[PDB]
Amino acid sequence: AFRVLKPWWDVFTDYLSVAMLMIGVFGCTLQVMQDKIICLPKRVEMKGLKTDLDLQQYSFINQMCYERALHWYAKYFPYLVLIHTLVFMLCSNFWFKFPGSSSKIEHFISILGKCFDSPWTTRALSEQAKALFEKVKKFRLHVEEGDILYAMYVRQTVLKVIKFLIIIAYNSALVSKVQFTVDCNVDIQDMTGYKNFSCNHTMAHLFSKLSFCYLCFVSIYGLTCLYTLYWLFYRSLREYSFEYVRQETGIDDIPDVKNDFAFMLHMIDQYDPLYSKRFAVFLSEVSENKLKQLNLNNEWTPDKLRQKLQTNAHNRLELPLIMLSGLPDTVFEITELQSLKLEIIKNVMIPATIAQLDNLQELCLHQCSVKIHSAALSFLKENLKVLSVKFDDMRELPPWMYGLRNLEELYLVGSLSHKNVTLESLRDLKSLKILSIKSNVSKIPQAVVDVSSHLQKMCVHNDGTKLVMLNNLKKMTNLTELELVHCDLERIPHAVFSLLSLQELDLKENNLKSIEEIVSFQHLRKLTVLKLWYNSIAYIPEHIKKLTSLERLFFSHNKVEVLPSHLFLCNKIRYLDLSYNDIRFIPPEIGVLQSLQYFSITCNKVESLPDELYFCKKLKTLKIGKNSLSVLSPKIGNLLFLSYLDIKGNHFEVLPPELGDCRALKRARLVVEDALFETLPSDVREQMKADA
Amino acid sequence: AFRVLKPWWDVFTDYLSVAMLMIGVFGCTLQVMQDKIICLPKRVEMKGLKTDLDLQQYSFINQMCYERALHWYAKYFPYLVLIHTLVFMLCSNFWFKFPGSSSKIEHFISILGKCFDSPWTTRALSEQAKALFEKVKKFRLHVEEGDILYAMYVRQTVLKVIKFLIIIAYNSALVSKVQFTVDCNVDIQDMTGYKNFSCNHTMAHLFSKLSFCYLCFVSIYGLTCLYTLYWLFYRSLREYSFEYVRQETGIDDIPDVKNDFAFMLHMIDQYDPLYSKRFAVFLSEVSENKLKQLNLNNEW
Amino acid sequence: KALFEKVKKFRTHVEEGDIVYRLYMRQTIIKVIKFALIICYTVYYVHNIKFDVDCTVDIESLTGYRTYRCAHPLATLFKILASFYISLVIFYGLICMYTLWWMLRRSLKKYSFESIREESSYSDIPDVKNDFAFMLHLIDQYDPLYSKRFAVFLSEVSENKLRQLNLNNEWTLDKLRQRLTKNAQDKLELHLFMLSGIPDTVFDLVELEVLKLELIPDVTIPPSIAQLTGLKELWLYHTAAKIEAPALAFLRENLRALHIKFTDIKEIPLWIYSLKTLEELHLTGNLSAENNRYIVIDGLRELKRLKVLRLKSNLSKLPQVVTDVGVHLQKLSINNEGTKLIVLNSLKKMVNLTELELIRCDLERIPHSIFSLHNLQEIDLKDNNLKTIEEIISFQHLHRLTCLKLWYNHIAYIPIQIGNLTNLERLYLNRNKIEKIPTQLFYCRKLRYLDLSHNNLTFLPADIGLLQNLQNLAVTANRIEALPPELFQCRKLRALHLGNNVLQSLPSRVGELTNLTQIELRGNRLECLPVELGECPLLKRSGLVVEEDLFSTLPPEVKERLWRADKE
């Protein structure tokens, strides 16, 4: 605060200033006490030479000749030196007596002393310091915008140099002007009868010697000033480059500083070369990461991880992470977790401690830039079987995820095309069976063809992008279940016709209207599941009868106005979704759907149901929905296997009691109005609700 | 307590007062030791000019002419400088030497130091101070009903400017009166036989230059006081709105301050804007609520 | 600890410098020479101060006189002052010369530091370089004791002792209690890994049964190990540890098994041969040496009670001492892990052997000496690259031949001579290229466990009903598409590993498998699960390894009972 700001030249200038103050004050004292001029007239066995004058006349003549003959600078030399020394001291102290910048100086001293005093800097170079970190950042945000302190110091040094130069330049000439003796011819004659007077004052030659010594002192002072200014005009203190801390501690942070911080750091280095090293630690970003990680590890407890441990979507022991700055090693102490979920966690570095997480197969990453160690990468390569990744701008995607040979399932949520897919080769994913990607991919990547030799299920569900190139999808020889959603295709592709091993098929949100290519779906005799969700479909060809392999049918949210009879020809269909369409009448041929276990016509104009629909005795799920039904038949009592029933929103008056004859049907599985259910008897409603 | 109540112009005035006091002491010492008037009869190969007078007559003539001829201002000038500098120092110290307002000043210094010393202020801007909040509010119940401190300080500044004005006004006229030489005609004839006497005192020109330097210093002091008084009647220190804590920290509390509190905050901002910012943390209702919430989560 | 850290930091910082020494030397030189200069010229000019002076300034136009005699009253006083001051200067110069001569004689750029460490036996007190020795010598000039009061903090032994104290402070018996685990042998294990030193608190938990040490730097066993009654097995991984006599005595009768994993020969303590109650010994790491191989382990003969032996050393010759000590060995295990081994006929001398394992020894053939072991009952020859195994006919010699393993080899055919080997109860020949099962294999009716997975097999002979004692068979990764009815004739079949085959359909006779506990069908090309699979009394979902879609063909009541038994 008062000592650490002073380089060697500052100390030497201070000592010279004290010496000059002593010189000036002593000269003033001697001028006050002993500086007197003795005068006698000049113009005139030896005897006395009395001029018959008294002592008062002597005194008057001494006064007059002292005023007249004595050189003004000779008389004012003590005051002159005192004034110049006072100016030097005032301008030297004014740097820290200036409160506006002295506040910044004091804050810098406090922060530097506290940072050097902090033991954590020594620990990291090998508690509340983290909080102290905050102040450091605050300081480097507010004080880097200064540098007026540096200009003020430059002004002070310039003024001191100018004063020294002037002092030397004029005192060198003025010293010779003074003499021990002096003479004066004033009109003291006719007042005393003498005009010429030889006089002298004692302090002359002593003053001359003292002045010579003082001028030599000022010369050394100016030499010190010149050395300081040369060091100022040779190093360009506007920027301080460490270039050694980064080399030694390996921390590429502490990049540079502004003009003011460079000035202060250079001054500290001149004062001491190690306090800067101890001070820069709290500016280091990697050191700050180390302190944050250590504090977070100490704060974290494995018990909270055990409590927050849950199951993932795919029935694995998941440990979700919502907001973390790093990896708690306590998480590595939890080896029983089968899933791990990271959400919005940047700068993740997985050490070899992942070897502790032995029983790990699924990893969920949501907007996380995750880097591993080679040991961690190997452990994940031989142990990670499922992976869930969310990326926003591809900047969070780790490359090493393409090297997992034991990975089976992959989840992506993030655009790739940003027209081609920016996908790295899926060559090392030698066990990849399931691939689900959420992007806006335009053309199907070749990388998946690098994995299709063993890949079993590839799915891309874009946000509406139109899939252009269908050549690669023809190569999916080992593909088993294909799901295409919202691909804006508007037509049935030729690639699926080249995929005979397809067992499940999905065309959700593809907005198909003319779907007459089922003849080319007979080319898939394993086409057990085929989906046409969220399409403009209104026409069903006869040739759909040729897919005897059909076992599940989806036609929800379509423009189908009338359903045909031939649609009932595929007897093997067990799931029937005809909801959210324009269906009003159900043709009686639905009676042949004996194995039909699901039938949903929710939100249609269904106004009646033929009795043959109840011939589907294996119907365990019936969802009529808000349709235009007005009456319910007693024959539904024959559905002993009905588990879920939904007829809500219709125009029923009285529900037949035979609904209670459905053993698997409950009140929870029955969706009826309060009045509708009230029409059922007391015993039936009690059995549906409880065991009476 | 004794340091942060001094803006830069206040320290400058302190240095000027010290210089003026030292100069007055130097002049008084010079007058005590060496100030003497030498007198000779005026009216009269070149030889001596003996007037057959003795040393007792010499001293008596010196006494009578110094008492008569020399200007009373010239004789009292070191004393006058000493008196005015002493008045300046007395009025400078009296702002804190009056216990009635000094108690409020000391309490303000202590509470500001305690509040800025609390690190929870930095926590909020990013323990027992919660109880210290009471003192803060107690303090805002006590000193905001003052503002007589501001009136006292304004009286002091006006009096200092008036002193500088009067000093310049009459010292400028009196400065030209001092002369190296002088003459006096007293009825020392028939007591010594002579009436006309030419006289001179050594100090005259040195004291003239001393007066020149003193008047320059008085001019500097007047400039400083003028700047202070002008700043008093331009920024309207009776009200202080932060408009920065509310905008930066996003806290809509801290509505305003009273005349005394606004004046204190203005003076502290003159010394340092950041200490006021760190003290404003505990006037923040939002911060105080956050600290109460933290204490409650700890205790529950 | 922070004091030690700052000591190391300061040693790095200043021991190099040698700056303060140079500056003080320069200052001493300046003081001495300046004293010499003043003592010269002042005494040269002392005489000039005289009370009476004679001056002729030649001022006659003002006075008329020429010569004047004058008196300076203080000249005698100034002479006194000069003599007093120059006497003070002489004293100052004597002091300065003493200082400079002492400094030149001392040569204090390296602190000897050997007397203190020699007296206190603190050998870790190295001599410090310039800018540290000079200050040390100055402080010794002030006070020698202050040197020693710092020496103990340059003592590495002291630093290690302080770190050991901190290590003991950190550990709590509760954390070791939670750190105690149970191995596969139901033995309480406290495996200390990458731990700097022994905290003696671990000696309080006598319930410790197995201690496993890895990457622990050269500790010495204190006698307090005598408190660990339950320790029977020991595992030391890459540690050249030392021992104490009471510890050695306690382990001499309280050690049953020992396991060592060393990268270098010296990591084996030599007092191992003194432990006479050792029964099982495990060694891992290349112990191979040139012209002195099997000589470092010559003390096994002293281990009279040695019974079990596990070797993982990539050996090519059977050790002589091992062969000699095999007289009382009942089991020997060698894992040359790639290196081909020559028995040199020296394997038959251990007739008392009962089990023999040679895994990855690259044998490529069966030496005759193996048949000489009449007490041998089980044998594993994994990864010996065995293509022809027709020698099994000599296995008629072993009347107690209970089990045999020749898996992970080139065996593609089964010699019929195994039909002579009726004594077999288990067999495991997986990871081979076997394509057919001879009927003669079913002549070893004592067979109970089989693992013929990963083979070219495509059928099961009807003679499986002959092997009624069979309970576990694995045929994973084969060409099996048919199941004989006779497979279901063994009603005591407990668990099966039949997954990943080309099995089209499972015959309904699966209900005959009354003891069926676990079944693997994952990967089979099945379509409908037989309903009689759901009537097996010991069936559980855990014991049902099959895909969910194919499993869904089962009746819903079967699924409900399966889930109920899963919850119960």
Residue numbers in the entry:
A (entry chain E): 16 to 59, 95 to 176, 236 to 527, 531 to 804
B (entry chain F): 16 to 59, 95 to 176, 236 to 409
C (entry chain D): 241 to 808
Question: Can you quote the paper on this entry?
Answer:
Volume-regulated anion channels (VRACs) participate in the cellular response to osmotic swelling. These membrane proteins consist of heteromeric assemblies of LRRC8 subunits, whose compositions determine permeation properties. VRACs are composed of proteins belonging to the conserved LRRC8 family, whose expression is restricted to chordates. This family contains five members in humans, termed LRRC8A–E. All of them share a close sequence relationship and consist of an N-terminal pore domain (PD) followed by a cytoplasmic leucine-rich repeat domain (LRRD). In these assemblies, LRRC8A (or SWELL1) constitutes an obligatory subunit, which is essential for the targeting of channels to the plasma membrane.
Because the binding of Sb1 rigidifies the LRRDs of the four A subunits in the observed conformation, thereby restricting the accessible space of the corresponding domains of the two LRRC8C subunits, we continued to characterize structures of LRRC8A/C in the absence of the sybody. An arrangement closely resembling the LRRC8A/C1:1/Sb1 complex was observed in a dataset of LRRC8A/C obtained in the absence of Sb1. In the 3D reconstruction generated from this dataset, we find a consecutive arrangement of four well-defined subunits that are organized as tightly interacting pairs and two less well-defined subunits. In the latter, additional density at the level of the LRRDs can be attributed to the subunit occupying the C1 position, suggesting that the absence of Sb1 would allow for a better integration of the C subunits in the hexameric protein. However, the LRRDs have rearranged compared to the interactions in the LRRC8A/C/Sb1 complex (by rigid body rotations of 16°, 9°, 11° and 10° for the respective positions A1–A4), leading to a weakening of the tight interface and the creation of a gap between interacting domain pairs. The described movements of the LRRDs of the four A subunits have expanded the accessible space for the respective regions of the adjacent C subunits, as manifested in the emergence of density of the LRRD of the subunit in the C1 position and of the CSD of the less-well-defined C2 position. Remarkably, the relative orientation of the LRRD in the C1 position is distinct from the conformations observed for the A subunits. It instead resembles the arrangement in the LRRC8C heptamer, except for a rigid body rotation by 17° away from the pore axis around a pivot that is located at the interface to the PD. A similar LRRD conformation at the C2 position would result in a clash with the contacted A1 position, requiring a moderate rearrangement that increases the domain mobility, as reflected in its absent density. Considering the observed symmetry mismatch, the incorporation of C subunits and potentially also other LRRC8 homologs into heteromeric channels would perturb the tight interactions found in A homomers and thus destabilize the closed state and improve the activation properties.
